[PDB]
Every structure is written in structure tokens, then in C-alpha cells.
Amino acid sequence: RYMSRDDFRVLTAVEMGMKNHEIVPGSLIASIASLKHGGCNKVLRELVKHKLIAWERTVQGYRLTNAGYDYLALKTLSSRQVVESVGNQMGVGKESDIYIVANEEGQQFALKLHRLGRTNVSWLYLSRLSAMKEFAYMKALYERKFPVPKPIDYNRHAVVMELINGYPLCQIHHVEDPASVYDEAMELIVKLANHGLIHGDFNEFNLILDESDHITMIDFPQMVSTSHPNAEWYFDRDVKCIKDFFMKRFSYESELFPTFKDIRREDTLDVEVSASGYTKEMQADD
Numbered sequence: 389r390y391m392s393r394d395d396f397r398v399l400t401a402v403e404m405g406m407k408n409h410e411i412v413p414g415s416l417i418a419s420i421a422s423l424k425h426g427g428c429n430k431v432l433r434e435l436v437k438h439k440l441i442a443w444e445r446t447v448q449g450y451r452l453t454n455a456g457y458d459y460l461a462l463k464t465l466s467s468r469q470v471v472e473s474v475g476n477q478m479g480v481g482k483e484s485d486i487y488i489v490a491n492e493e494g495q496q497f498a499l500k501l502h503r504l505g506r507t508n509v510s511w512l513y514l515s516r517l518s519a520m521k522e523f524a525y526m527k528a529l530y531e532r533k534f535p536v537p538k539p540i541d542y543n544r545h546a547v548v549m550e551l552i553n554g555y556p557l558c559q560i561h562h563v564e565d566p567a568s569v570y571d572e573a574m575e576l577i578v579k580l581a582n583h584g585l586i587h588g589d590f591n592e593f594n595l596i597l598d599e600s601d602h603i604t605m606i607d608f609p610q611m612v613s614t615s616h617p618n619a620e621w622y623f624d625r626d627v628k629c630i631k632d633f634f635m636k637r638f639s640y641e642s643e644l645f646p647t648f649k650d651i652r653r654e655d656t657l658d659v660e661v662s663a664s665g666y667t668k669e670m671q672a673d674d
Contacts, residue, residue, distance in 0.1 A: 397421050398431045402452045410508045413449035451508050461546035470541045470548050481607035502545040515545035522547050524666035528659050536605045554598035566640035572603050573630050578646050584656030586612040590626035592633045620648035
């Protein structure tokens with residue numbers, strides 16, 4: 389509802405202070421925040437009420453909530469006119485919640501809200517890094533003509549991207565022909581591998597099928613380098629997950645499946661160098 393910059397500053401102070409300490413005490417928040425009419429203990433009470441923050445007891449203070457972190461990122465993105473309205477949750481990634489958003493112009497985009505960490509300090513830190521990783525790797529992959537959505541903008545744990553019109557393969561019971569859709573997923577495995585990457589979670593919950601039955605990689609949070617001592621294990625596991633899915637969903641069994649010896653390297657690394665490059669540029673601001 390009605391926010392005010394004084395209320396947004398205290399939220400950013402709870403956030404700032406959360407880098408160190410599980411719980412940021414009032415006195416340390418008043419210092420980081422600053423004001424006029426100085427009514428900080430008043431603003432903290434107004435923030436507790438709107439459940440953007442929470443109070444806890446060791447001694448004794450404030451933590452930003454999931455709703456608070458969500459608001460900080462969504463309001464920052466709004467200032468840039470990347471998000472004007474948030475919809476219902478329509479998806480999930482391995483460590484994220486997918487939502488449909490809209491800009492000022494009424495154009496619809498997807499939004500990923502990353503949620504990782506089982507400790508306050510490692511929660512806002514790892515969720516931010518997980519968002520930094522997705523934007524960096526989508527930028528790097530999209531530049532190399534990989535079937536991934538277009539990266540739009542990032543902030544904190546929030547990643548705005550091209551909305552892909554279509555459904556995940558787990559929702560598709562009938563395909564025109566499983567022979568082409570099966571081969572395209574296997575080609576994406578070999579393609580990633582040729583660029584020095586192994587997905588790690590190649591499945592029917594991360595692959596989206598569009599109008600003319602094309603595949604789009606939506607979530608790739610824990611990639612493995614083909615240089616890994618156990619890379620061939622990770623490669624094959626991803627292959628077998630596709631064979632397991634097609635055999636049960638459409639009963640499409642085939643012998644046109646790849647092996648780790650079929651991989652022919654090119655630029656590899658480059659993709660990591662490009663993705664690391666984007667992560668450094670993003671890390672330069674906080």
C-alpha cells in the first residue's frame with residue numbers, strides 16, 4: 389500500500405545490516421537508516437505490521453522477510469519501468485518461484501524470485517548470488533544462440549526475462565511426433581557439452597514446449613563443467629532423464645542417444661569467462 393521513502397530506507401537498512409548478524413538490532417538500524425522526523429522505531433512498527441520485516445529474540449532484533457526482499461527488488465525494478473504489475477505464481481525453478489509480470493506498456497514478462505539458504509545471512513546472500521548466476525549464464529548462453537529466454541533485468545534475487553509461450557514437457561501428454569522433440573533435447577545436451585557445460589537437472593520441469601514444438605531451457609542452477617573428473621556421469625544422468633521421460637510419457641524408445649566421447653570442444657571455456665565477466669560487472673554494485 390502507501391509506502392513513503394522513509395519506510396523504504398529502513399527496509400534497505402534492515403537489508404544492509406543483515407549482511408552481518410542474523411538479527412539486526414534497532415539501534416544499529418537507526419544509525420544505517422538516518423531520517424527527519426527521525427521516527428524510526430515508528431517506521432519499524434509500520435513495517436512489522438505490513439509483514440515486510442519481523443522481530444526476534446542470544447539477543448535481539450529485526451530480519452527482512454521473504455515479502456520484504458520481494459518488495460525491495462520489485463519496487464527497484466518498478467523505478468526502471470520493468471515491472472508495473474505482479475501476477476499469480478505459475479511456476480517454480482529448483483531454487484526459485486516463477487511469476488508473470490507486466491511493464492508500463494502492458495507487455496508481459498516472466499519473473500524469477502530466487503529463494504536459497506537455510507540461515508538469514510546466507511539466505512539474502514545466496515538468493516542474490518543465485519539471481520546473479522542465472523542472469524550472467526542466460527546473457528552468456530543467449531549471446532551464443534542457445535534456446536533460453538531473453539534476459540531483461542536483474543535486482544537482488546529477482547530476474548526478469550522473456551515469457552516463453554508454451555508449457556513444460558511434464559504438462560504435455562500429446563506431441564505431433566516424439567522423434568523430433570526427443571532429438572532436439574539430446575542436441576541441446578551435446579550443444580551445452582560442446583561449450584563446456586553440463587546442465588545437472590535436465591528434465592521435463594525445466595524444458596518448455598512452444599507452438600511449433602520447440603524446447604527452451606528455463607532453469608539451470610547447478611551446472612557442471614565438462615572438465616569435471618565425474619563429468620561423464622553428469623552428462624549420462626541428464627541423457628537417461630530424457631530417455632526415462634520420453635519412454636513413460638510418449639513411450640518413445642530410441643538408440644539415437646549421445647555419449648561423452650561424441651563431445652567436440654570449441655571455445656570452451658569462453659562461456660564461463662563471459663558469464664564470470666557479467667557476474668563481476670553485476671557485483672560492482674550493491
